[PDB]
């Protein structure tokens, strides 16, 4: 779809809040590939996602997968902290013929076989063993791999996203000192040239920087999640309102500067979804009811006028 590409930013922003520069960079690289300006035998895009934990990296990879390939299922997550022990290559691409687990294939290769159109997410690439890192280079160069079975795995329709906890303490200092996004991107690059040779970094479409989320941005994520929960309740014809306090209650608990907004899912589950379920099962919240949710001395409270 043409205008899907032409309006990819607002499309990715349907699910991902803030990180405009990150989304612009991503959207621009997909457009160059789709216009036919880059190598047809390389992947669609290769990115290095930098910044703090839980600020929209996975959610961007998911949204990109849903937007371009119809579903979030078209995202493959390979955590490199599990592939650092040298015997890891056979886990990624398969055990050799005659060895236990040859018929199983490899974690990455089998996933990209049954989903040639997929977004691939590599977590903490610095941790990966040099031999695992060489396989990553082969994807970036050849646009293809050969697994242990000898079957060629195509990567030309994939979008490669690499993440790194490396360089994030610098970008935090960058925003503290008030540097523009431009020079933050340029300063982190020098930190990266100390852990990766420019051989690798030049193959990347963009070096992408994610910021910490502001108070306003956290609210917008809460709203988006309440929007999905609202759809589920609408099937029972149940309306749900939250007071500003109730929205701030969830925002305060669902975000911390260490894990980002990762706690939010189970905060919403523990503080809103589990209590609401109880009220529904008891009979206090019925089909056709409009619920107002407010803050009390113990937690969120539910009332039906
Ligand atoms: C089924 N999933 C959920 C259900 C309820 C609440 C959150 C989630 C969930 O996956 O929530 C995810 C998405 C959400 N989030 C963080 N930053 C942003 C942002 N800038 N824009 C939009 N969302 C963001 O916070 C959670 C963690 O973020 P992440 O992007 O998965 O982590 P990381 O940035 O480390 O990859």
Residue numbers in the entry: 545 to 849
From the manuscript:
In order to perturb the open, inactive arrangement of the ClpB NBD2 catalytic site, we replaced the Walker A lysine with a glutamine. To crystallize the mutant ClpB variant NBD2 K601Q, we supplemented the crystallization cocktail with the fluorescently labelled nucleotide MANT-dADP, which has been routinely used for nucleotide-binding studies of ClpB and is known to bind more than 100-fold more strongly to NBD2 than unlabelled ADP. This compensated for the loss in binding affinity owing to the Walker A mutation and allowed us to obtain a nucleotide-bound structure of ClpB NBD2 K601Q. The complex of ClpB NBD2 K601Q and MANT-dADP crystallized from a condition containing PEG 6000 and yielded a different crystal form to that observed previously for the wild-type protein in conditions containing 2-propanol (P212121 instead of P65). The structure was determined by molecular replacement to a resolution of 2.8 Å, showing well defined electron density for the previously unstructured pore-loop region (residues 640–650). The fluorescently labelled MANT-dADP binds at the same position as the unlabelled nucleotides in the structures obtained previously. A domain-motion analysis using DynDom comparing the MANT-dADP-bound form with the ADP-bound form showed that the angle between the domains decreases by 14°. The essential sensor 2 residue Arg806 located on the C-­terminal small domain forms a salt bridge (d = 2.8 Å) with the β-phosphate of the nucleotide. An additional phosphate ion is present in the active site at a distance of 5 Å from the β-­phosphate of the nucleotide, suggesting that we may have captured an ADP + Pi (product-bound) state here. Interestingly, another highly conserved active-site residue, Arg621, adopts a different conformation to that in the structures described previously.
